[PDB]
Amino acid sequence: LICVNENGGCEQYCSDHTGTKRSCRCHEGYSLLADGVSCTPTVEYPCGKIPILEKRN
Amino acid sequence: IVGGKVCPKGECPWQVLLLVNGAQLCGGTLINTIWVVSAAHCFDKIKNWRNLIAVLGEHDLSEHDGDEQSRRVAQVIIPSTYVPGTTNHDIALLRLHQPVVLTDHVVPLCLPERTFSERTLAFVRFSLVSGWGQLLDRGATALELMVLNVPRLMTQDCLQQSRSPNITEYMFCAGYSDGSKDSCKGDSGGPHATHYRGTWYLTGIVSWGQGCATVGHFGVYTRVSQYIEWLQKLMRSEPRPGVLLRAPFP
Ligand SMILES: CO[C@H](C(=O)NCc1ccc(CN)cc1OCC(N)=O)c1ccc(O)cc1
Numbered sequence: 001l002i003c004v005n006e007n008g009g010c011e012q013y014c015s016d017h018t019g020t021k022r023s024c025r026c027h028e029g030y031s032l033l034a035d036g037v038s039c040t041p042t043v044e045y046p047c048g049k050i051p052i053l054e055k056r057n
Numbered sequence: 058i059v060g061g062k063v064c065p066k067g068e069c070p071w072q073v074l075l076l077v078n079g080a081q082l083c084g085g086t087l088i089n090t091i092w093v094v095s096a097a098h099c100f101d102k103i104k105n106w107r108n109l110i111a112v113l114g115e116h117d118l119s120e121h122d123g124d125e126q127s128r129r130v131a132q133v134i135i136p137s138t139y140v141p142g143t144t145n146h147d148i149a150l151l152r153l154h155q156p157v158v159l160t161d162h163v164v165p166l167c168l169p170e171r172t173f174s175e176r177t178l179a180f181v182r183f184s185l186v187s188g189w190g191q192l193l194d195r196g197a198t199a200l201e202l203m204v205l206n207v208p209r210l211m212t213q214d215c216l217q218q219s220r221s222p223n224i225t226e227y228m229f230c231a232g233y234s235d236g237s238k239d240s241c242k243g244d245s246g247g248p249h250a251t252h253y254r255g256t257w258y259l260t261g262i263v264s265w266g267q268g269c270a271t272v273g274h275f276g277v278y279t280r281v282s283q284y285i286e287w288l289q290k291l292m293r294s295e296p297r298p299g300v301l302l303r304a305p306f307p
């Protein structure tokens with residue numbers, strides 16, 4: 001996988017590494033899941049999410 | 058904002074209102090608890106830098122509902138390359154004197170990594186722009202926060218579709234050429250926010266255009282991806298005496 005195509009499969013940030021390797025990363029306030037692509041909030045008010053709508057669902 | 062809708066209270070929680078001596082100046086975007094991104098041009102005519110206030114959690118300017126949080130602006134940082142009265146490099150980074158408290162009504166927008174923004178966010182067609190600016194060209198400003206969904210254009214396409222400042226690599230076009238929908242004067246500095254896989258990111262700053270919602274012209278926004286490393290370096294820096302700071306760019 002490569003970061004320029006489909007964001008390398010990452011939900012947030014993507015780094016290419018030497019030799020068919022890719023690492024996904026997450027913004028502060030999020031942690032990467034064991035799937036290696038998904039980011040889950042670790043704080044009450046993570047950036048870029050709208051509390052009243054997150055609670056709405 | 059021309060041709061948008063009221064942003065339901067709490068649905069634009071990163072929006073900032075900038076005031077000078079109590080009067081509306083511009084918008085901005087909260088990106089963490091002490092840092093706000095706005096437009097350089099908002100500060101061209103400031104005389105007393107010590108009367109600048111940022112308000113978070115604002116919605117209706119006619120009433121106080123208790124969700125508003127006001128802070129003094131301790132630093133206004135502008136790139137060396139910005140020239141007052143012109144269009145290029147239209148970005149400012151503002152340090153608040155004290156952090157805001159995050160709540161359901163006050164939440165930062167994510168400042169993306171450059172690669173992610175250039176490779177992925179730049180190709181998301183629609184994004185939201187918001188503010189308390191003019192509801193019509195030559196019209197009154199909004200009392201409730203307004204929001205508008207605008208499509209982004211590649212600059213080559215913007216130039217071909219438009220019919221006078223250059224559109225530089227530090228800008229991008231978004232909106233409509235039929236005169237129905239645009240951001241306006243008083244929205245300057247506010248967010249152009251882009252959704253990707255459940256999270257919103259800062260991709261532009263309301264910057265300029267030919268009037269507001271002028272037929273044959275699109276809105277022009279500061280291309281925030283060009284400034285990620287500049288912003289991140291400044292956020293790691295210690296404050297300096299005196300509010301205005303010009304910082305080298307790149
Ligand atoms: C650098 O920005 C200023 C400025 O006034 N920006 C305000 C603004 C925000 C959004 C929109 C429409 N999206 C239009 C706007 O202004 C339209 C106008 N002034 O006719 C500028 C400077 C020099 C120049 O030649 C043109 C603009």
Ligand SMILES: [Ca+2]
Nearest residue numbers: 117118120121
């Ligand atoms: Ca209010």
